[PDB]
Design a protein around this ligand. Sequence first.
Ligand SMILES: Nc1nc2c(ncn2[C@@H]2O[C@H](COP(=O)(O)OP(=O)(O)OP(=O)(O)O)[C@@H](O)[C@H]2O)c(=O)[nH]1
Ligand SMILES: Nc1nc2c(ncn2[C@@H]2O[C@H](COP(=O)(O)OP(=O)(O)O)[C@@H](O)[C@H]2O)c(=O)[nH]1
Ligand SMILES: Nc1nc2c(ncn2[C@@H]2O[C@H](COP(=O)(O)OP(=O)(O)O)[C@@H](O)[C@H]2O)c(=O)[nH]1
Ligand SMILES: [Mg+2]
Lengths: 430, 430, 49, 439, 32, 48
Amino acid sequence: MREIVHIQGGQCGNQIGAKFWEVISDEHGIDPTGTYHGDSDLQLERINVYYNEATGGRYVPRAILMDLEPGTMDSVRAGPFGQLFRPDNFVFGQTGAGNNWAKGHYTEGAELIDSVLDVVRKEAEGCDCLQGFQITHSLGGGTGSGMGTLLISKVREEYPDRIMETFSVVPSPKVSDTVVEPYNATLSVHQLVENADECMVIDNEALYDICFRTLKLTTPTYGDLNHLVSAAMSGVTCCLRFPGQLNSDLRKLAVNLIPFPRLHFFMIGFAPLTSRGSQQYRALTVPELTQQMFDAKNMMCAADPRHGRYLTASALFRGRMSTKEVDEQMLNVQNKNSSYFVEWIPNNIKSSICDIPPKGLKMAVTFVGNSTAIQEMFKRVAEQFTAMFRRKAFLHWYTGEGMDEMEFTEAESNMNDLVSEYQQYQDATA
Amino acid sequence: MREIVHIQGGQCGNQIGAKFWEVISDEHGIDPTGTYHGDSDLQLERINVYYNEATGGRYVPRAILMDLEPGTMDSVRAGPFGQLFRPDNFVFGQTGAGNNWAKGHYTEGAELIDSVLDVVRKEAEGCDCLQGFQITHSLGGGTGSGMGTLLISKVREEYPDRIMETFSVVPSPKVSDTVVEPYNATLSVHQLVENADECMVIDNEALYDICFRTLKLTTPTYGDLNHLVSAAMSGVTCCLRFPGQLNSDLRKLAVNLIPFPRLHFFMIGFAPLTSRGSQQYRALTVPELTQQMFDAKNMMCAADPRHGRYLTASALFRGRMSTKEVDEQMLNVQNKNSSYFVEWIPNNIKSSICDIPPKGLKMAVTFVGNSTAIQEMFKRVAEQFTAMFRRKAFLHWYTGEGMDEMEFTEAESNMNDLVSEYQQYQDATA
Amino acid sequence: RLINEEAEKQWQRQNAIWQKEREAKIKLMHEVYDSRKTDIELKQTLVQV
Amino acid sequence: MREVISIHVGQGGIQVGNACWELFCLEHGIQPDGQMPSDKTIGGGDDAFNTFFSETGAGKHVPRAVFLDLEPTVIDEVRTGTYRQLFHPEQLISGKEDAANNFARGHYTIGKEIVDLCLDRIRKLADNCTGLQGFLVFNSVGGGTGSGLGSLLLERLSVDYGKKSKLGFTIYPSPQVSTAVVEPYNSILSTHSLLEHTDVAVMLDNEAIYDICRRNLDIERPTYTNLNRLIAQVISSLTASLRFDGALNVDITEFQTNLVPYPRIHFMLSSYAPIISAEKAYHEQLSVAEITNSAFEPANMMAKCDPRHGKYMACSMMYRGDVVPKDVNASIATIKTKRTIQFVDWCPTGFKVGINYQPPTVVPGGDLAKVMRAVCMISNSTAIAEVFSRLDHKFDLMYAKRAFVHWYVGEGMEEGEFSEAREDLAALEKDYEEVGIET
Amino acid sequence: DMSYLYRSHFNLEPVQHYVSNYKQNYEPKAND
Amino acid sequence: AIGTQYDSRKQTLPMFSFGKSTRESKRGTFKDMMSTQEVRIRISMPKF
Ligand SMILES: Nc1nc2c(ncn2[C@@H]2O[C@H](COP(=O)(O)OP(=O)(O)OP(=O)(O)O)[C@@H](O)[C@H]2O)c(=O)[nH]1
Ligand SMILES: Nc1nc2c(ncn2[C@@H]2O[C@H](COP(=O)(O)OP(=O)(O)O)[C@@H](O)[C@H]2O)c(=O)[nH]1
Ligand SMILES: Nc1nc2c(ncn2[C@@H]2O[C@H](COP(=O)(O)OP(=O)(O)O)[C@@H](O)[C@H]2O)c(=O)[nH]1
Ligand SMILES: [Mg+2]
């Protein structure tokens, strides 16, 4: 009943999922080998949302791991919770992309996508009624972005009525990981906005701001960093699997977050995230939950949220908490700080509740808002791209595999127009 | 209900606050671990005034500690009664202003005050309904005084309707401790006058004189001074947190101890203070309380109070005592010294009574009064400032960081006008 | 009481995570200085020869 | 997160840094070998050595110092001594050929090819430092190599590390006791070069130290080592405020803003007390008033000048031990009331006071005796003009008929470099006259 | 030890926690 | 009950407001308690 499937590609994409299943795996108490040891039934009522059934009682996570090189996907196999993945669901090439979108979306990606697409059409139809697709990938990668931006394009071709989703990580200009980051970043965004209904961005550089200051752990590690993103995973899809006061599936959030079809970029957040050493003094209270919930330093994105205004905000709480206090506390956020909330649309925050909380705590909140501040993400991206195109630097690698110089120009114009159109409503007044 | 917050600055402020918080914790019965161990019910009725509620019931003082140098803070966090403070509120710098008012108010403080203002706003809003502030700071230190004064205006620009205090310790020439004390004290007072709602200056020289002549202890110590200061502070706000005959919050004394807008300096003293051998040959009697309280030598301001007349004087007789007796004694004292009470304001003393006494005393009274005698410190400060400025001594330091001599020229005129207007009323007659 | 049950359990595994790495590095650090003693002497031993 | 770096040049600099380092090491508790004593097992801790040492992660502790000289013997002796396992092997950059008392040689001939290494090392050591407060420099005036290298280091530091506070512990020649026949020239040149870059410097003329050593310790055959010990204790007393707990603190940054009345006059002289040998220390009571009085007494002023011959305008003193503000102010009131020591008109108070607890560690095998209270003072007094007055005369007499000018001219220095230095000194000579005159 | 400078040496010295309000209680009811 | 009321019996919940702290507004130190507690050991050095 309204279940979803996971489609992920790329080492960055693989790792996000690899840790993704671990956190979810504990939510309903599925053991590493697939042996059930749950205590409360509610953990087993809506398991169809993510798992199928097979003889022997061992559960399968319906995933499709895709990459063009063997190193990354061969890694999650030997570690914990990697044994769950069905061997037949792995499709992988043998060549490698070299961070070159041209090699990752036209020559090599197309040849292999035939088989991978086949399995995609295989599992999805099996469920009673597909709800949608959630895909995690990386905009700054070569092999990932190509297929990641491509598989989505064809998937949207066969299932026009399905709800689409994509969680992304974008390269900040400060600490750059790929010398070709501007290309594979801006080039991808053109295709993503064409078919994907929804899209999210998490800034790695902003993540480290989460660790070095909030968690107060001296040696953050990729093992540690993935955990935060994993939590946000359950932030959105949470209430879809448990009873609650006001259920809010994926599609309902779309009906209340996108003013026009061409603004589908949101920034997320999680709270409470408190360091180990200070945990005793604070007092868990929903109001204290919200202030840190709207805190400027809790958003995982690099865009400063005080430099613009919010077009719409989302809330997805956790636990047995008073219905009113959410309502009373939610309104005050739109009055004491009116300067930052747009004026032509009233009461511009929605809320929802799930009565079963994430493991270990008593209250939790997931943050989702379409903020005009996200413009600064691409202008910086565009600025580097324009600076790197005038002299035709790094032009031969991409143009040598069939892509012409005309294609880049179309990509830039579309990016530039979105920049302006995004801020048209910022200055708009009623 | 009508809670207050604490924000201390400089090494002197940090030590003074450390002693004050220990005194408060002892008076309300809170152990270092933060677990209630009181005896009567009343000790917890209004504990909200100064503390905050957290899971498990361990109460945390709502103090904010600021400094540009770390050693004092890292020391105060390890000493006795140092584990009650929230580690979150510790916000501080590293370089310091080096006893330079300009350095502490313009170059470094401008950068550092952002976080401190954010945290102070967080706590003040979190309280139920802010009643006011309390800032204790040392005028004689540059790095302290700079930020201490800057934050005064910063807060006063956002909380116009709130009431705020200023516990200040001013350096006398005889008890000189810093060569730039003239400059920093004059510059500080220039800003303090214009915005501070209330100021209570205490003199280290007078403190030493009292400690030696009255207590008769073989050797005073910084703890010895701090304990007296903390006892005075506790008297200053005793009646706001216990049942009493006649409640008198901060606003009542604010109205009853300010003749005109620009005079907001008083002097205080705590009694009784008796020699360990004199604690039993003495009689804790109502007349003795008033006699010792109006005795000149008990004032912590080095200026002799008798050199002029009082404008307004109010007392908080703490513990259970007489009322007929307070009224009659006030009348007798106001008559017998007719010339020493200004003539144009009849009924020129205020009486306040509260029931709960201190742990160890049955009768104790805190004296707050605004008298003309304070002009001595201001006149001496002005003379010292002139003797140096007229020769351009130590001038280039404050000018090399953006402050021009025009500001110095402006401040002295304002101080001189304040002195003149304060002295004028001495000769006023009806 | 149970509110403490889940929190204590989760922190337990994570700490075992903090212990597993630290115990891993500490042994290697034993290796790091271990060799240097083994190499200085060889230089020391060759000096006489 | 507080640290400082010591830059040293000149044989006197190295031999004073030695003693100061034994003092500081014995004070924190690190054996010479660099390994923490297995019995003590300090365990988890911070500060202490950080303010003067940088954690290596495990095991040894590198003293945050750099030694630079153009002469090989002292460097070789230090490397081969009993402190070999302490310092970094390659941070002791040592040259080959001696400068040979030629200041001009120390500034343009054999200094430019090694100042580059000096600056590279200083930068590397600084970048790791995250809480840099300032610098300490020990360099001699009467040595050509020392003067030239110190001048180059100060000039480069003024352009590399910004307004970061710097302190300079120079050493000038005594009014009558001399070691060389060409001291005045390098003295004048160094004064000129260093005037406009060093914020603070304290006199350490040798003859006065000889006088104090003879008078108090009652030891008749001193050597340079004892003077180095006294100097190292002076540095320890000055800097103890930054790493031990105390009721009232003052930092290195809080000196250059509290003892320099004008941007130009930034020379002050200091003194130490008490200095009593163990043979007789305890007979007096171990009178804080008498100790403070001795602090100001004319004889023990470490620089040969008469305080009675000039006014006072700035007196900064630190206390350590079981000092208490009660005694502090009781003594300060009497000193101020005194008439024989008077204060300038426009200096109503020239006292900056800091209180510290840790007593001065007494080293075995030396002359310093165990005590409970100490007083160390840094004073900038109008009497400072005397030293420069005497140096000027010592210079013009020689220059009257171009004595020894041949070698200095032949080392690349232009003819007129000396006249400009003389003019700068005269302008300085005029200033002390101007500032010291009452309104 | 540094205790001789740390804490204060002030001495100021049970069933004294009754409000002045607690003077009102009980008092049982008493032609031609 | 969805705003401000004036009676001690019924409290008024706080209404939080955004701050103005930049992503890199300095501040640090106070590393006494930390997640990792960086490793330190004692190994004797040779005599060279
Ligand atoms: N206090 C003290 N001063 C010394 C000592 N040794 C030399 N001096 C002084 O240093 C002056 C000469 O310069 P040195 O420091 O000896 O030599 P240098 O610094 O290496 O410079 P060069 O002589 O050119 O190599 C003499 O006039 C002495 O006054 C010492 O051990 N203690
Ligand atoms: N947060 C996080 N980011 C990752 C991780 N692995 C990779 N990335 C990001 O992914 C980017 C590289 O993408 P890449 O692996 O080349 O994509 P590909 O084309 O599929 O190979 C880098 O900029 C990283 O910031 C991870 O484990 N955690
Ligand atoms: N009475 C008293 N005064 C203190 C104490 N601590 C500091 N002070 C005052 O603080 C002044 C020095 O200020 P300073 O430490 O330089 O302030 P900062 O520069 O902001 O750290 C002195 O004049 C003292 O009068 C204390 O414990 N008791
Ligand atoms: Mg030499």
